């Protein structure tokens, strides 16, 4: 029920719908500008990125990292927890089917109250556009106002 702004590159800039995850209150409230990274392994973030020696920590003076993550195989909350542990500043979950947006919900059966990073589900189309812009060498910048 919210949106987001891809600010770069020109080929895909614009305002896109998205569905904010229904878990965690972001610690540093306000507006967040990031650079989008699509991981080369563990793209569904159901296992820890440490096992892969993969980190999304940004170097001093560079944009915080927004990790693009594919839907599948594990709970949304676990993906947010795993990506948070790898140091992403936010998580975008590309939907697996082309369909209207759904709201990522919490499960029940805990780390849940320890999830802090902004989370959102985007459409498969925007997910595919971002990946193709990145594949072609353009960094994909993005701003979140939630």
């Amino acid at each position: 029920k919210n949106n987001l702004k891809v600010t770069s590159p020109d080929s895909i800039k614009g305002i896109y719908e998205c569905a904010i995850g229904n878990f965690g209150v972001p610690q540093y409230g306000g507006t967040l500008v990031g650079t989008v990274v699509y991981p080369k392994s563990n793209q569904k973030a159901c296992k820890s990125y440490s096992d892969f020696d993969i980190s999304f920590k940004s170097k001093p003076g560079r944009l915080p990292t927004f990790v693009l993550i594919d839907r599948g195989d594990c709970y949304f909350t676990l993906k947010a927890w795993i990506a948070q542990q790898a140091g992403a500043a936010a998580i975008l979950v590309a939907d697996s089917k082309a369909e209207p947006l759904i709201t990522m919900d919490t499960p029940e059966e805990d780390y849940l109250q320890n999830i802090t990073i902004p989370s959102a589900l985007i459409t498969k189309t925007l997910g595919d556009s971002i990946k193709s812009a990145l594949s072609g060498g353009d960094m994909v910048n993005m701003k979140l106002d939630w």
Binding site: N22, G72, D73, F76, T103, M104, D105, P107
Partner: peptide, 5 residues
């Protein structure tokens, strides 16, 4: 809708 996964 909503979902957990």
């Amino acid at each position: 809708r909503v979902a957990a996964a």
